[PDB]
Amino acid sequence: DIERPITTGVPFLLVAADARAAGLGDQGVATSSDVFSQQWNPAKYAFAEDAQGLSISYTPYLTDLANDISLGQVTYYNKINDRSAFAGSFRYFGFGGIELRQTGDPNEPTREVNPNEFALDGSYSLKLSETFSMAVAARYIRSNLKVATEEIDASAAGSFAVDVAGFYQSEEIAYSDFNGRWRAGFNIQNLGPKISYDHDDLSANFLPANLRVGGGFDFIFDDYNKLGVSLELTKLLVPTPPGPGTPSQSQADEANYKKYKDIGWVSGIFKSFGDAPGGFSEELKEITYSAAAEYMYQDAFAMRLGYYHESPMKGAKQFFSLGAGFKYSMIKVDVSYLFSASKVKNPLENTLRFSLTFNFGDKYETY
Amino acid sequence: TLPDVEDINRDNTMSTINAYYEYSIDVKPGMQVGENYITDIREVTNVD
Amino acid sequence: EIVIFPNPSDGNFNIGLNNFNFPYSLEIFSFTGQKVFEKQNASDSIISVSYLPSGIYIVKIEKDSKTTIKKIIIN
Numbered sequence: 001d002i003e004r005p006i007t008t009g010v011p012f013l014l015v016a017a018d019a020r021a022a023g024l025g026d027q028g029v030a031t032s033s034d035v036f037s038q039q040w041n042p043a044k045y046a047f048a049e050d051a052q053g054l055s056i057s058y059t060p061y062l063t064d065l066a067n068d069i070s071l072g073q074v075t076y077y078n079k080i081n082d083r084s085a086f087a088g089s090f091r092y093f094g095f096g097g098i099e100l101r102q103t104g105d106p107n108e109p110t111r112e113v114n115p116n117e118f119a120l121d122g123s124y125s126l127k128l129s130e131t132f133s134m135a136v137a138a139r140y141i142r143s144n145l146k147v148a149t150e151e152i153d154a155s156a157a158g159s160f161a162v163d164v165a166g167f168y169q170s171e172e173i174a175y176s177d178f179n180g181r182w183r184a185g186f187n188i189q190n191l192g193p194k195i196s197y198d199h200d201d202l203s204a205n206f207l208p209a210n211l212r213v214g215g216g217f218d219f220i221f222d223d224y225n226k227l228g229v230s231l232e233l234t235k236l237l238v239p240t241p242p243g244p245g246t247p248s249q250s251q252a253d254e255a256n257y258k259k260y261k262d263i264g265w266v267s268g269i270f271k272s273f274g275d276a277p278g279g280f281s282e283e284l285k286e287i288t289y290s291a292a293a294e295y296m297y298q299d300a301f302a303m304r305l306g307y308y309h310e311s312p313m314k315g316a317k318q319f320f321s322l323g324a325g326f327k328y329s330m331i332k333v334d335v336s337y338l339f340s341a342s343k344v345k346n347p348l349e350n351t352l353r354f355s356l357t358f359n360f361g362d363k364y365e366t367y
Numbered sequence: 368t369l370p371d372v373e374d375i376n377r378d379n380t381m382s383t384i385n386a387y388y389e390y391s392i393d394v395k396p397g398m399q400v401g402e403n404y405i406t407d408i409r410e411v412t413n414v415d
Numbered sequence: 416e417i418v419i420f421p422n423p424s425d426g427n428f429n430i431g432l433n434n435f436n437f438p439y440s441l442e443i444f445s446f447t448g449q450k451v452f453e454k455q456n457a458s459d460s461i462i463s464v465s466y467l468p469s470g471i472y473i474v475k476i477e478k479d480s481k482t483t484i485k486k487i488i489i490n
């Protein structure tokens with residue numbers, strides 16, 4: 001089973017929030033530029049084909065049981081020039097309204113509370129070369145999942161993070177049987193101070209600092225058909241909690257945990273590459289991977305297949321994913337479904353994610 | 368906000384009966400597991 | 416209307432039925448969607464599910480054709 005998973009604050013930041021990347025096995029760091037390219041790689045916002053774009057995405061939890069328990073996302077990008085773009089995203093995980101009542105009075109004004117977790121971020125992407133671009137993003141994360149009662153304070157826990165992303169999109173290169181295109185991308189995200197849910201300097205949780213490196217290739221057939229294959233590797237930049245012991249009986253574990261929790265996030269980013277009894281072979285177990293293929297017809301129909309695999313010793317989240325995308329005139333609708341292949345019950349099973357984007361403004365030529 | 372009332376179970380009636388069972392634990396510096404109803408002791412060394 | 420006694424409970428709570436046909440079916444679901452509590456032929460108001468781990472839970476009340484879904488907190 002899972003052996004010593006990495007524990008981080010606000011894990012909902014790692015959940016894919018859009019259907020397009022959900023259908024591609026939860027990867028977007030090296031796919032084609034799109035409106036949802038904020039959680040994955042803001043650097044391709046400078047490569048966007050359309051000037052302005054807005055998008056609303058819905059991921060339901062407990063689809064059969066009840067509504068209002070879902071992860072929604074609103075993204076808006078605007079590329080002012082051929083070289084730069086400003087984007088803003090808002091992710092909101094919520095349980096809906098919950099009524100708090102202590103007495104059976106039919107006429108009783110009760111308190112309705114909505115525990116939630118939202119991240120509001122803004123990114124600037126600048127195209128350095130004709131085929132390469134960088135991006136810097138600032139994110140504010142707020143968690144209000146706990147409910148105010150006696151001896152419990154429901155003050156929200158907030159934090160700030162910075163994301164550095166880079167995207168490379170080569171020119172359309174002709175081959176023997178087709179004329180494909182190469183893409184690459186990297187993203188170091190969720191870099192910031194620890195979030196303290198108890199508002200105490202003694203108890204803090206690492207932000208889910210993440211490193212995503214990916215590459216993709218497009219086979220272009222007849223100039224109207226595309227097949228893009230993408231591969232992404234993801235690694236958490238958070239130190240792994242100690243396992244059995246690395247110095248009485250419980251005192252060794254206590255000392256190990258005290259040493260682990262007394263580590264700065266800046267030092268924790270570099271310490272993530274190692275800090276375990278295992279070597280490089282065991283270090284490769286910290287990297288999760290995703291491989292997807294997306295077929296584009298008339299640039300208006302999209303059929304996406306993906307496979308996402310984590311290590312069985314951490315997270316244990318491997319699955320296949322299907323996705324469909326349709327563009328009518330300026331509105332693109334994406335639907336995604338997930339077939340889990342792991343032993344742990346994925347909370348996204350039997351869930352159809354929905355995504356809806358509108359594109360407006362003038363057109364920018366692709367190089 | 369509630370008034371202080373000599374009625375704890377909120378049945379509007381004040382009970383005056385004293386039929387109960389009594390249990391007791393000692394509080395001593397050197398208590399150990401196996402006596403005084405003690406089942407577990409966790410010693411924490413380095414508290415921040 | 417269906418009434419749930421203190422919503423941020425420890426696992427022990429109560430139901431607020433309005434003195435109607437007492438047999439109702441109560442089902443408590445975890446956030447994973449797993450079935451964690453079943454109760455048919457239910458008439459006792461007090462519900463003891465304090466063995467469940469902390470978190471939000473979904474309570475379904477089925478009373479004849481009436482269906483109701485509410486969210487409770489176990490802390």
Ligand SMILES: CCCCCCCCCCC(CCCCCCCCCC)(CO[C@H]1O[C@@H](CO)[C@H](O[C@@H]2O[C@@H](CO)[C@H](O)[C@@H](O)[C@@H]2O)[C@@H](O)[C@@H]1O)CO[C@H]1O[C@@H](CO)[C@H](O[C@@H]2O[C@@H](CO)[C@H](O)[C@@H](O)[C@@H]2O)[C@@H](O)[C@H]1O
Pocket residue numbers: 052054056076078358360361
């Ligand atoms: C921070 C984001 C703020 C929100 C942005 C909203 C943008 C609204 C612009 C309307 C729009 C985008 C569709 C978006 C709909 C998504 C709604 C999501 C619903 C959520 C659940 C619909 O336009 C399309 O929709 C049709 C309506 O059905 C229109 O029909 C007709 O529509 C009317 C004639 O336009 C008739 O009156 C109506 O009779 C017709 O029917 C058609 O004109 C067209 O097909 C077209 O955009 C155009 O409008 C201007 C407005 O000044 C926008 O200016 C921008 O504003 C800032 C951008 O925010 C930028 O900074 C700023 O630089 C930039 O100048 C431009 O973009 C421009 O190109």
